Design a protein around this ligand. Sequence first.
Ligand SMILES: *[C@@H]1O[C@H](CO)[C@@H](O[C@@H]2O[C@H](CO)[C@@H](O)[C@H](O)[C@H]2NC(C)=O)[C@H](O)[C@H]1NC(C)=O
Ligand SMILES: *[C@@H]1O[C@H](CO)[C@@H](O[C@@H]2O[C@H](CO)[C@@H](O)[C@H](O)[C@H]2NC(C)=O)[C@H](O)[C@H]1NC(C)=O
Lengths: 411, 411
Amino acid sequence: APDQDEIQRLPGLAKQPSFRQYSGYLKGSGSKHLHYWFVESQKDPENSPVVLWLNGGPGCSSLDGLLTEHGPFLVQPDGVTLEYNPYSWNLIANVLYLESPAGVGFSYSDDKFYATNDTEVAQSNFEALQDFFRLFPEYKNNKLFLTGESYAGIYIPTLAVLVMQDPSMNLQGLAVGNGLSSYEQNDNSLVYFAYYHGLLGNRLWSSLQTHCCSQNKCNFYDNKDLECVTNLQEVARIVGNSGLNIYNLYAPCAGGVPSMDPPCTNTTAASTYLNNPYVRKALNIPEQLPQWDMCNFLVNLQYRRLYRSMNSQYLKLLSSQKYQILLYNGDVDMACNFMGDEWFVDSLNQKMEVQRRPWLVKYGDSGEQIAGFVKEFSHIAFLTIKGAGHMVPTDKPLAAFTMFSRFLNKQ
Amino acid sequence: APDQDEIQRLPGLAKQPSFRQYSGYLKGSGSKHLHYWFVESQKDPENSPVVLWLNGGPGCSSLDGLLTEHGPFLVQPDGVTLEYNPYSWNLIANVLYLESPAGVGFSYSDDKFYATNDTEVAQSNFEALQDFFRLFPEYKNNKLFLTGESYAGIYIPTLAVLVMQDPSMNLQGLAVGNGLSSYEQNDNSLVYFAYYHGLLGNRLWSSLQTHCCSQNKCNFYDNKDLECVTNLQEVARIVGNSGLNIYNLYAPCAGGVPSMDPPCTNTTAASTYLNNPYVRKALNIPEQLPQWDMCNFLVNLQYRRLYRSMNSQYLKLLSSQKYQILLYNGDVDMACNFMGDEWFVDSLNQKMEVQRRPWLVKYGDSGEQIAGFVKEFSHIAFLTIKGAGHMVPTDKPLAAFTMFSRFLNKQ
Ligand SMILES: *[C@@H]1O[C@H](CO)[C@@H](O[C@@H]2O[C@H](CO)[C@@H](O)[C@H](O)[C@H]2NC(C)=O)[C@H](O)[C@H]1NC(C)=O
Ligand SMILES: *[C@@H]1O[C@H](CO)[C@@H](O[C@@H]2O[C@H](CO)[C@@H](O)[C@H](O)[C@H]2NC(C)=O)[C@H](O)[C@H]1NC(C)=O
């Protein structure tokens, strides 16, 4: 490990971690410096898997994952106190939170040119992974898992196809949380999700059926009927610009209904904590770097999307038969709704189709509870988390942890 | 008012109510004695509306409504303490909770014959209402509202048609919470609700489409295709006997997943409180009467359902143009799902169709929030409560209270 990157005293913690943690920079492609934060397994790190975590956007910080989703400690609303997370994914894994691509959070490049695309982010992320294993050569042999959320539905399978060609990397699987797998399948599934969750009436529904659909099949993705393109625009206003939280339909919109920062979300606690000078010092962040934001508007603004489907990435990964893949969706998210990703996994037409069943979690008091539904194929599973939104570990941490543990243990 | 029915000191309250409340018996048909609990408006009772409340079952106690939904005080988990309810419907109304029909809770008959049907429950409820106005003649002139939940979707429109013929009763409207309006529309809507809430996969969905449906229209109600009747049976196992809370999909099943008392619900607090001898004395319950249960299995067991649709009751009530009607559904209930009741109200084909829009509530902190969706016709509105289950006021009390206030004020 690089001893100069080790965090010794993290502001806002009342007890010192039982585990070693590092903050520094992985070399991406060209002049890119990707800020990492590595937290070793609370149990047997030497042999616990290494787990890459990517948040999406594009241009959103993986440190959101650490401080608000499944990190070893979570920022409190004061933006000062960190509290230990009993459901931390680092209970059983060495977790690498990577700010990616360049310009996101504390990540930067010397040429300070932050315009990028899916193929370049994969290649840079791949080079940062190689840099990680040069700094942490004691972790080269551990099981590697590539994981992430939302746009990491593109980041992770594109990165995975690069990693499966480097035999020095012990790739065992990938997991994508509420992931963008297929624009078409997302967009089509979202319209159904809207109607059957009571957001649209029969007036607008009956009309979409008539002008967007035929022979039992609907096109809400690239459909060109005038009335169809008109109906779908009211659907976007209702879902996206009416004051519903797109990340969790049953959650309030933070800041209330309107009469980078994601809509209906409050990033103040994390921003307050990470912009503290002493927090930056503890995290070994160069003093010259601009303020930490959750999402970089400019990376988002100048980003160029290349892939519309991950069908070929997944079938490449599945054709090797070496890797276990999990796509997991909170079933009350509307940004990357569960049905779109379930359609996606089904449309891969894989073998060993093992029947859709409920999966269970024991809650300390309430006992065994349905945590969601699972569908297992050969080397790929689709899974819902019942009552979780876009940030599954934030909404349902025990279900998120149970899912993660079972995925790692291939059981 | 009958002074001998007034409750003076209710066990488990730390402060005495600002309002008068009564517990005694309304004469139903024949030898039926229906136990009532009347709570006068906390504000200007003399002029506040009179509001009948019925819980459903059949055979479930309206005292569930008082002590766990929208009463002036709510039982705590100790089953001893009552705590004042800041969202009590009795803030602005004289609320009559009626245990109905005979044998439910503290209700009884001398002949002790508890087998009944929809037409007899209406007639008996109608006679109890007449008895109420003989005991409370000072409330004859106040605006009367008929309200209830679940099977009261049948109780209330059947009772309403009897009440609209007695000119001595000042009927202004009715409101039905998560109500059974049409078996067909419930059953058909529930199957869609199941699939689009991620409870069924494409295997079972694709099959239902093929064997239960045609020309864009599905029959999940009375359909006879062998495969259809087979698919619908897996749907009932998943929805009803897998460990999902049928009353609130996103809530845990009380008692955990299985490997009268409703499934996945814990009635202990209310039962503990109402079975206390001193509580019975305060509530003027005859010592001879058997124990209080939330739901009477036997009334349920011997009950005979007569109506399959309330279409004719509602069109009778609407044809007068004298009454305002509200059907309100928690949109995560599966026992009487919102879509079935929205289809129902739409299929009444009324006039003044006023466009489906979100409705708002101001939460003290979080500010203005979408509380659900509303569709206003002439004299009838359909309304969802976003994230509420079967017991709307239990899950979303401020949204329940706001809805109620606006319904009463005809605004
Ligand atoms: C967004 O989050 C911030 C930080 O959690 C909230 O600010 C806090 O408000 C509480 C309530 O009074 C205070 O006790 C804290 O001291 C505040 N924290 C800070 C660092 O100022 C803020 O209210 C939230 N805003 C919205 C609209 O949800
Ligand atoms: C059902 O509700 C009852 C009553 O609320 C629960 O019993 C209580 O459990 C808590 C937790 O220890 C105790 O503090 C209370 O004293 C208990 N109340 C009574 C009156 O015994 C019970 O646990 C619930 N059961 C389930 C499965 O949800």
